Amino acid sequence: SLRDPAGIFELVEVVGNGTYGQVYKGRHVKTGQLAAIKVMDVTEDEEEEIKLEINMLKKYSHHRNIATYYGAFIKKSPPGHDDQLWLVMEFCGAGSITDLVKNTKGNTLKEDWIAYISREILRGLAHLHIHHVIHRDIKGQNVLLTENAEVKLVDFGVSAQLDRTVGRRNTFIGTPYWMAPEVIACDENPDATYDYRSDLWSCGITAIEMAEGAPPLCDMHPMRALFLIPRNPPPRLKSKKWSKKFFSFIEGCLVKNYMQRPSTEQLLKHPFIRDQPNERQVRIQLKDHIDRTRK
Amino acid sequence: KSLVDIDLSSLRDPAGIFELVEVVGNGTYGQVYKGRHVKTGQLAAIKVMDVTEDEEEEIKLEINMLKKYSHHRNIATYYGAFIKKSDDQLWLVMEFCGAGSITDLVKNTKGNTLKEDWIAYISREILRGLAHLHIHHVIHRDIKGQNVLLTENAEVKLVDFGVSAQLDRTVGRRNTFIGTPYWMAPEVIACDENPDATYDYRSDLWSCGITAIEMAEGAPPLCDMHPMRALFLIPRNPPPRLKSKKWSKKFFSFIEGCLVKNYMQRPSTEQLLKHPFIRDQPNERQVRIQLKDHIDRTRK
């Protein structure tokens, strides 16, 4: 059964805040080995159901573009309060793509770096989607880089699955900026769907976050952004500097009606993603940029 | 008993002023840790949040936005903001209330329902704390059972981690997150008729009405609905109403006053303090004794 993490894992620094909880750079206490730890409130005394749901999904974390599952821990709380679940995964040494862009001059990545990273996110998502798993938490903070620029998604469907089964009393709306229109309830969409294509919208927003350092509407009160996402036209890159292929990729990700949004396999064939003649050079440049940022 | 080393206008290192008396083992999001005021030995509640070194300028701005207001028996006193350098830790410090929240009170009661005269008493105490904030031009913004605490002496106090500047709702990009919707009044939710969602003093009174339903039924309306769907329905659905017919007409009437959907037609805090459900409490002395005895029994 799920153990208290005391003396096994500790939380060191925050890497992200998402749809269901927070992600930390954590540490295996007695080795000093790093881990990505996703901390999520869960309905109290549901350890058996939690273990069942995690065990059904963990095999999907072995893929090269998914941070590998290590273990799961629970912290108990007073009667009636949600328990705290710690989902422990591998940490990729270079940290998140959001931190990389924050630490880049002009808060912008080179276009061919964005194509490379976006393809790797799409490959991780295609693995989950073919296995009928929705991620539901795609954003720069949830995409980590290793020291040689391998790209891995944090979480492999657990937060999304626990939300829908075990649940919790401490629910919140969360930050809206990576949410697709179908995830936001309105007159035409009163029940707000769970469809794999919502991850592709989030992938488009993440590409804008790599290009501009922040998602669209980042300077707006989140309640006004939540209202505007289903109403506004698809977001677009602000600068004219980008290639027509990059604008075209964003148009594919950011089709507002999910029923008309391309699949993960269709986006992997988009020229922006499919045609990367400078891939080896990009990985060398990313490795060098990670090294320079560190110092 | 006024603390003499408090400074609500500055961001200081907490050394020699406040200390934590437990480890920060549950992360730095929505976590309040037990602390101590070093000079007096008085316990304190310390909300610990991770902050970037660049966020300090925004924190100092928000500190300047804090409004001045005295201590009040129905408000857990805010003791200020501190920075514990390393991301650094921001500490927001407040008076410690040791008997749990109103939500814990109802969750630990048979049938997850409080007696009507306890609800009238607790609701009046919440309204008295709100009247103190509102007269000082402060909106609380987060009235709910979890943010109404009890002391060991059965005093009812609102949580205050610096509500006039919303210090705990902004730092570490917390200002980009929408919390739980269930206690939100319609005016704070953006929609076609309300594109610029705005809090008013009266928004707290809607939340007070939802908190009275929470005491009556154990949970706010729509509590287990997906929050995005609840956010859409609050401006559309009729005012929430108690489900049981057992309650008095005065209690139904008080809920109708709190839960007027259009804030421009919702009564003020001073008007709700005169509502018969709040104003007329012939058993208030006995209710206080019952609450104290319930707290004593729970403790052991």
Within 8 A of B100 by CB-CB distance, chain A residues are: 78
Q: Which among B89, B94, B75, B73 is positioned nearest to B8, based on CA atoms? A: B94
Nearest to A22 among B29, B223, B231 (CB): B29
Q: Please say whether the beta carbons of B33 and B24 come within 8 A.
A: yes
Q: How far apart are CA B128 and CA B130, in angstroms?
A: 5
Distance of CA B181 to the CA centre of its chain: 14
Chain-centroid distance, C-alpha B223? 17
Interchain contact, A170 vs B30, CB within 8 Å: yes
How remote is the C-alpha of A124 from its chain's centroid? 11
- How far is C-alpha A134 from the chain's CA centre? 11
Going by their DSSP bridges, the two strands B148-150 and B156-158 should be labelled as: antiparallel
Catalytic residue among A41, A83, A112, A137: A137
Interface test with B, best of A172, A209, A231 (most B CBs within 10 A): A172
Whether residue A226 and residue B178 make contact (CB cut-off 8 A), yes or no, is yes
Q: CA B95, CA A90: separation in Å to the nearest integer?
A: 40
What's the CA gap between A220 and A230, in Å, rounded? 15
Which 8-state DSSP code applies to residue A82?
P
Among the partner-chain residues A14, A84, A173, the one whose CB lies closest to the CB of B227 is A173
Contacts of A17 in chain B (CB under 8 A): 29, 172-174, 177
Chain B residues close to A21, C-beta within 8 Å: 29
Backbone angles phi, psi at A176, to 5 degrees: -90, -15
- Nearest CA to B208 out of B257, B280, B252, B271 is that of B257
Separation in Å, CA A164 to CA A50, A57, B6, B51: 12, 14, 45, 31
Torsion of CA A273, A279, A284, A290, to 10 degrees: 0
CA angle B162, B164, B169 (to 5 degrees): 65
Domain annotation for chain B: domains and CATH numbers: 1-96 (3.30.200.20), 97-300 (1.10.510.10)
Nearest-angstrom CA–CA distance, B283 and A46: 41
Resolution in Å equals 1.5
Bridge partners of residue A190, in order along the sequence: none
- The verdict on a CB contact (< 8 Å) between A185 and B50 is no
Residues of B in contact with A80 (CB under 8 A): 103-104, 107-108
CA distance B211 to B148: 9
In whole angstroms, give the CA distance from residue A43 to residue A33. 30
A34-42/A22-28 β-pairing: antiparallel
Angle at A220 between CA A214 and CA A222, to 5 degrees: 95
Determine the distance from the C-alpha atom of residue B179 to the mean position of all C-alpha atoms in its chain, rounded to a whole number: 14
Terminal alpha carbon distance of chain B? 28
Is A137 tagged catalytic? Answer: yes
Q: Are A180 and A156 in contact (CB under 8 A)?
A: no
Q: B232, A185: Cβ pair inside 8 Å?
A: yes
Interatomic CA distance for residues A98 and A156, integer angstroms:
19
Is B197 in Cβ contact with A79 (below 8 Å)?
no
Distance CA B83, CA B48 (A): 10
Per residue in A5-18, is it b (16+ CB within 10 Å) or e — as a string?
beeebbbeebbbbb
Test A223 with B197 for CB contact under 8 angstroms. yes
C-alpha torsion angle, residues B103, B106, B109, B115 (rounded to 10): 160
Question: What's the token pair of residue B107?
Answer: 């969750």
Residue B274 assigned ligand-binding role: no
| Closest by Cα among A128, A122, A36, A18 to A86 | A36
Chain B residues near residue A175 by CB distance under 8 angstroms: 173, 176-178
**Do B90 and B46 meet the contact criterion of CB atoms below 8 Å apart?**
no
Which residue on chain A is closest to B102 by alpha carbon?
Answer: A80
Residue pair A227/B191 in contact (Cβ under 8 Å)? The answer is: yes
Scanning the structure block, which residue is given the tokens 């501190």? B82
B106 assigned ligand-binding residue? no
Tell me if A248 sits within 8 A of A271, measured CB to CB: yes
Contact (Cβ atoms closer than 8 angstroms) between residue A102 and residue A16 = no
Three-class secondary structure assignment of B212-275 = HHHHHHCCCCCCCCCHHHHHHHCCCCCCCCCCCCCCCHHHHHHHHHHCCCCHHHCCCHHHHHCC
3-state class (DSSP) for residue B12? strand
Determine whether the annotation assigns residue B147 to a binding site. Answer: no
* Per-residue DSSP letter, A4: P
Of B282, B291, B279, which Cα lies nearest the Cα of B250?
Answer: B279
**Nearest CA to CA, how far is A279 from chain B (Å)?**
34
Answer for the pair A158, A87: CB distance below 8 angstroms, yes or no.
yes
Chain A nearest-CA residue for B109: A80
Buried b (16+ CB within 10 A) or exposed e, A199-232: bbbbbbbbbbbbbbbbbbbbeebbbebbbbbbee
User: Which tokens hold the place of B291?
Assistant: 């609450």
The bridge status of strand A69-75 relative to strand A83-89 is: antiparallel
Residue at token pair 């594109």:
B195
Residue of A14, A25, A163 for testing the chain B interface, max B β-carbons within 10 Å? A14
| Method of elucidation | X-ray
Q: Contact, A125 vs A153, CB < 8 A?
A: yes
Kindly list the residues from chain B whose CB atom is less than 8 angstroms away from the CB atom of residue A226: 178, 190, 231
**Exposure of A247 in the CB half-sphere (CA atoms within 13 A):** 9
B25 marked as part of a ligand binding site: yes
Helices (H), chain B: 56-64, 102-107, 116-135, 201-217, 227-233, 249-258, 269-273, 276-279, 284-299
Q: Amino acid identity, residue A221?
A: H
Number of residues in chain A:
295
Main-chain dihedrals φ then ψ at residue A143, nearest 5 degrees: -125, 115
Q: What is the C-alpha to C-alpha distance for residues B45 and B96, in angstroms, rounded to an integer?
A: 5
- A270 vs chain B: nearest CA distance in angstroms? 32
Closest CA in chain B for residue A218 = B176
In whole angstroms, what is the distance from residue A32 CA to residue B105 CA? 42
Q: Which two tokens stand for residue B53?
A: 């070194």
Residue written as token pair 């108990």: A76
Who's near B142: CB < 8 A, 6+ residues apart? B159, B163, B169, B179, B183, B207
Which two tokens mark A38?
Answer: 């996703």
Say whether B27 counts as a known binding-site residue.
yes
Number of helices (H), then strands (E), in chain A = 10, 8
